[PDB]
Amino acid sequence: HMEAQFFTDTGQHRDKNEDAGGIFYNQTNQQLLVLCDGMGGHKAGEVASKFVTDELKSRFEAENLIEQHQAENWLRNNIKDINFQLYHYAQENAEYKGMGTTCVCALVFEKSVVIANVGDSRAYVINSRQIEQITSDHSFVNHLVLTGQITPEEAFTHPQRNIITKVMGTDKRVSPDLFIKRLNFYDYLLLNSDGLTDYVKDNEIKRLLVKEGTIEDHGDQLMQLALDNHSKDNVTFILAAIE
Ligand SMILES: [Mg+2]
Ligand SMILES: [Mg+2]
Ligand SMILES: [Mn+2]
Ligand SMILES: [Mn+2]
Ligand SMILES: [Mn+2]
Ligand SMILES: [Mn+2]
Numbered sequence: 001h002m003e004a005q006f007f008t009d010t011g012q013h014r015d016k017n018e019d020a021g022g023i024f025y026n027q028t029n030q031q032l033l034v035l036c037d038g039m040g041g042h043k044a045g046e047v048a049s050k051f052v053t054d055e056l057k058s059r060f061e062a063e064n065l066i067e068q069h070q071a072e073n074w075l076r077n078n079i080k081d082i083n084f085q086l087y088h089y090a091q092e093n094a095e096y097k098g099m100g101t102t103c104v105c106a107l108v109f110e111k112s113v114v115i116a117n118v119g120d121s122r123a124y125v126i127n128s129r130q131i132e133q134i135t136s137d138h139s140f141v142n143h144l145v146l147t148g149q150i151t152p153e154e155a156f157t158h159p160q161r162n163i164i165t166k167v168m169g170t171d172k173r174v175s176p177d178l179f180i181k182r183l184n185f186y187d188y189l190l191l192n193s194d195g196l197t198d199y200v201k202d203n204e205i206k207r208l209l210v211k212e213g214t215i216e217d218h219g220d221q222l223m224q225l226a227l228d229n230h231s232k233d234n235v236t237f238i239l240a241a242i243e
Contacts, residue, residue: 001031002108002189004240007219009227011195011234018045019193019236020053020101026063031108032056033238037121037193038101039167040233048086048101048169055082056105071107071114072178079103079116079168079176086169100169103176104135104191108240113189115179119164121193123179124205125186125242131206134179138166156198189240195233196226215239 010017018038025031036052038045059078066074090096102119115123120137136142140163141155155161168174183189188209197205200222208221219239226235 001025001029002240002242003215004031004033004189004238005215005219006236006238007223008236009223009234011227011231013232014040014234016046017234018049018101019195019234020046020049021191021236021238022053022057023238024057024060026060026066028065030066032060033106033108033189033191033240034103035105035121035191035193035236035238036101036103036168037119037195037234037236039099039164041162042098042100044090044096044099045101047096048090048099051086051089052082052101052103052168055085056103066107068109068112068114071109072116072180075105075107075114075116076176076178079105079118080174083118083168083174084172087172090169098170100167102138102164102193103168106189106191111184112180112182115181116176117179118166118168118174118176121191122197124188124190124192124202125181125183126188126190126206126209127186128210131202133202134181136177137164138177139164183242186242189242190237192237193234195231195235196222196237198233199229199231200226215241 021035036049038049102121104121117135
């Protein structure tokens with residue numbers, strides 16, 4: 001397990017905190033990091049994000065041992081099952097119909113992490129020289145950037161810049177992206193909701209983390225930075241020190 005801490009803030013302009021997440025432990029004290037961004041533009045985003053977080057917590061705490069070679073399959077199969085359960089929960093309740101959430105999560109191992117991603121929450125590794133975004137945003141503007149219809153700078157001003165193209169809960173099927181990243185020579189793992197990186201640039205995160213300070217020091221500084229940049233969203237992240 002890593003030294004890790006969860007940080008969240010409703011922010012200024014939101015009725016609810018619809019982000020969710022946590023740091024969970026199974027029966028042999030292996031660590032799972034979870035972050036979910038419930039959709040603000042649909043009903044009941046906090047129900048969706050807390051549903052997925054609660055399911056991952058309960059499923060993981062029920063396990064004895066998931067070794068590294070088992071982890072991609074465990075994450076893929078549980079995300080698909082949770083997506084299925086969330087979809088039908090929303091379909092059975094008119095006040096929840098259409099709800100959904102992103103999810104980024106990470107199973108921690110000695111020298112590596114296994115990450116699953118659905119949506120436009122992110123995972124990064126950071127060291128003194130670089131910050132690498134491991135995940136790829138499932139967002140409509142990322143689609144527009146990859147098809148070369150807009151530049152990445154326009155994405156910050158585009159009228160549909162909040163639309164996401166893969167989400168938990170809105171269809172009975174989902175296909176998460178899985179990543180395996182070696183941790184050697186990195187200093188930090190960061191999982192975050194778009195409330196952070198829609199407003200704080202990658203080099204700003206790197207500059208903050210490369211200074212001395214504890215995980216709690218850095219996370220409070222990073223939250224204050226997102227707020228100083230006038231984030232209009234819930235802001236959530238897990239910061240973990242590699243080691
Ligand atoms: Mg809402
Ligand atoms: Mg280093
Ligand atoms: Mn949200
Ligand atoms: Mn977004
Ligand atoms: Mn958000
Ligand atoms: Mn530091």
